[PDB]
Symmetry: C3
Subunit: 129 residues, 3 copies
């Protein structure tokens, strides 16, 4: 059945203002070059990276809502252990590593992302047989 | 399987303008003090109450889309019988009462909420084994 | 289990600017009269048609994410074969035809739509026993 659900809305202008400020979470998510590019709120980079961020946040929220989260505070490494990339067609793919990959070996994570104008959004559904 | 699905988008400024106007639905949802606070569109209260409203609306829409809804018009008491609160971590919890609680005793309601800038959103999925 | 998931966000002003430009996809979706009406971004027609579009796009994205999509590029006819209408209560209904109807005879498509201010959104979940 369904294990967790998450939805996330991201302001593309707010994201652009934050994404290239030094810090481990964003450095663990995007490259310095990606972050420089996305700091321009009018850019394709800003729009597309904002949707990837929305997707990652939606997955983490779905995980935080699930039985797999034992404490209110997110576990160390979760932003390294959960990544959402897009193929050359814009379609999202979830990649897990570390402890998250270990614990979620037997669940599926569905994700969809979207954006328009100044807003990006994503939904994630974690599910098991 | 899935029983119903709902998504809701809420304008935080529009919400702030409506939330403190006298009426049973909002009075059944939030306290007078909460509604006064949220009438200021720039306030944290407005943003957070708007997301709770989006969540409640998303649950009601999921319910209205389901076999549990017998008529087009919502049943008396549904805004009293369905509430969405957040714990001190911002995580949503669904509380049912009245006839709704009775009829939905054997289904699960998943909900997620989010907000940024002038927009709040939520998704709800009702599901049964 | 879940077969595919899609979320779509639509700018109502951008939609209004595009919807009445001649082209097969929109002509296969809405009538000339509907499209003329919706070209006025301030109109009820624009808001409601934008949400129907968001819903159709969300279904197509859920389909594109599923095993039913064999190639990256959408198949011929998919915009004719997938339609989302609303009843007189604003509630969405999915209608399939052509090859899509044939291949999806044994799956369910859940859809929800919403709008406020300048934004419409929808989510779709395809599911099978």
């Amino acid at each position: 059945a369904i294990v967790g659900v998450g939805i996330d809305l991201v302001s593309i202008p707010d994201f652009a203002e934050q994404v290239d400020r030094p810090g481990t979470v964003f450095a663990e998510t995007f490259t310095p070059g990606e972050r420089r590019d996305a700091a321009d709120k009018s850019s394709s980079a800003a729009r597309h990276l904002a949707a990837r961020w929305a997707a990652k946040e939606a997955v983490i929220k779905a995980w935080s809502s699930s039985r797999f989260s034992k404490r209110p505070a997110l576990p160390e490494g979760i932003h390294r252990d959960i990544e959402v990339v897009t193929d050359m067609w814009g379609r999202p793919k979830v990649r897990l590593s570390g402890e998250i990959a270990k614990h979620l070996e037997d669940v599926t994570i569905h994700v969809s992302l979207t954006h328009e104008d100044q807003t990006a959004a994503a939904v994630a559904i974690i599910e098991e047989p």
